């Protein structure tokens, strides 16, 4: 507190940490979704939800409490009978198309990362990226 708050030593991992740059020497960070245990758990939860959704009845109308103003005469069709059925179908199908969304997302991410050094200014303009792109084109 009173004295120098840094106290650099000859470790370079405490020295780098004390000045802010700690994770900046590792390739990729540490995350939670990278373990098979959490993956199995998430898959279990998703399968349970899909099971519950599929065990619903097909005839799943909804009484909307605003049908009062629509003077239904036992022959007309209520304009809101399919509102919980539509939501159930939407959730079920969205849960069944998860891998497709994952694939499209990873395609987008890869095709936007591969062009980082060409589309992002502060990466394209550093002397090191420019030097590397020049070094590749040496005839």
């Amino acid at each position: 507190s009173e004295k120098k708050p840094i106290k650099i030593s000859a470790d370079f991992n405490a020295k780098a940490k004390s000045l802010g740059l700690e994770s900046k020497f590792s390739n990729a960070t540490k995350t939670a979704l990278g373990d098979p245990d959490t993956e199995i758990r998430i898959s279990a939860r998703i399968s349970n939800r899909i099971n519950e959704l599929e065990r619903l009845p097909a005839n799943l109308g909804t009484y909307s409490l605003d049908d009062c103003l629509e003077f239904i005469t036992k022959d007309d069709l209520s304009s809101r009978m399919d509102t919980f059925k539509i939501k159930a179908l939407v959730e079920l199908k969205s849960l069944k198309l998860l891998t497709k969304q994952k694939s499209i997302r990873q395609k987008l991410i890869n095709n936007v990362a591969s062009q980082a050094h060409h589309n992002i200014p502060y990466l394209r303009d550093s002397p090191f990226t420019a030097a590397a792109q020049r070094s590749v084109q040496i005839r």
Partner: peptide, 20 residues
């Protein structure tokens, strides 16, 4: 990494003055 923000602000204030 919060100390370096104060350090940068101090250096900028140094650049603001003349007889410093």
């Amino acid at each position: 990494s919060k100390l370096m923000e104060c350090v940068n602000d101090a250096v900028q204030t140094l650049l603001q003055g003349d007889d410093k």
